[PDB]
Subunit: 100 residues, 2 copies
């Protein structure tokens, strides 16, 4: 039972400009969008386009042991996750599968 | 109608050996490939690549029925094919020919 990626947040310089580009190149759906970040649903996961000042980039995994690495925070959408960094300084989020 | 997939992500790390240890410790994932310049970790729904940026550039790869419409496809040693374009912010984007997978 391999852990899954849940979503990847990459830095962009202009959210509307990015959403225009990704949706014209890729078969995807705009799940959420304002002026500081956007979320694009793909078939196997979702891609957040983020202004790093407003929403830092990161990669999120599901983990049965997310709690063992940090205290789970509850988000407005009802899911639970915590953040850590890998040895390089990359932001890694561990989603609580039970909160999905 | 049918959504495209993210096929893999390659993120920059400072040290491939240590990064492999960390990810394989924190997550249920399989090492699929590894050298001193990069590694490929198999998760459930895609693969994660850990690259030294100066050897293998970080990028996100998507499967696309129209990959060849955006750039000339390149058959890689492993048989698969893909082009590389750039998003407005300069993020490297690889498009995979689904028939080559
Ligand atoms: Ni997140
Ligand atoms: Ni690639």
């Amino acid at each position: 039972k391999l852990d899954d990626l849940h979503h990847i947040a990459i830095s962009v310089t202009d959210v509307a400009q990015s959403v225009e580009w990704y949706t014209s190149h890729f078969q995807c759906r705009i799940a959420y969008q304002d002026s500081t970040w956007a979320l694009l649903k793909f078939g196997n996961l979702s891609l957040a386009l983020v202004i790093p000042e407003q929403h830092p980039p990161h990669i999120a995994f599901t983990s049965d042991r997310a709690g063992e690495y940090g205290s789970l925070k509850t988000h407005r959408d009802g899911t639970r996750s915590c953040y850590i960094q890998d040895p390089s300084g990359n932001s890694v989020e561990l989603m609580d599968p039970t909160s999905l």
